[PDB]
Amino acid sequence: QLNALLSSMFASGLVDEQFQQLQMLQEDGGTPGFVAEVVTLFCDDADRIISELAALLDQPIVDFDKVDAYVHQLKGSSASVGAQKVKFTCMQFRQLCQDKNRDGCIMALAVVRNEFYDLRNKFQTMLQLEQ
C-alpha cells in the first residue's frame, strides 16, 4: 500500500537512505508530525525556489550569483529529505553559473522542475495515505 509506494520511491531512486532514516522516525510513535513537517517544508521551499529561479533566468541581465545562492538553498532542502536526483541536479549549476550559461541553467532548471514535480506527487500521496 504505503509500503509499496515507499519501495517504489527507493527502487526508482527518487529518495535515497537518508529518507529511510526519516521514515523510520514516522513509523515509531514518538515524534509526531516531524516527518510531515520536514517533507511539507521541502515541497514549499522547493516550489518557491524554482519559481524564483525561473523569474531570475528570464531577466534581461541574469544575476548568476543569486541563481547560485537559490540553487544552493534548493540543494540543502532536497538534501534534508534525501531527494537525491534533485540534489544531484542542483550540483550541476555550478559550472553553469561559473560560465554564465543561461541556456544551461534553463535546461537544468527544467530537469530539476520535472524531478521535483515527480517526487512531490509521491510525497503527497505518501502523506495522504498516512492521514
User: Which cell is 112 given?
Assistant: 530539476
Radius of gyration of the chain (CA): 16
Structure determined via: X-ray
**Count of CB atoms situated within 10 Å of the CB of 130:** 11
Amino acid at 7: S
* Cα–Cα dist 33/39, whole Å: 10
What resolution, expressed in A, was reported for this entry?
A: 2.2
Are the beta carbons of 81 and 22 closer than 8 angstroms? yes
Grid cell at residue 104:
544551461
C-alpha–C-alpha distance, residues 11 and 24, integer Å: 17
Does domain 1-131 sit in CATH 1.20.120.160? yes
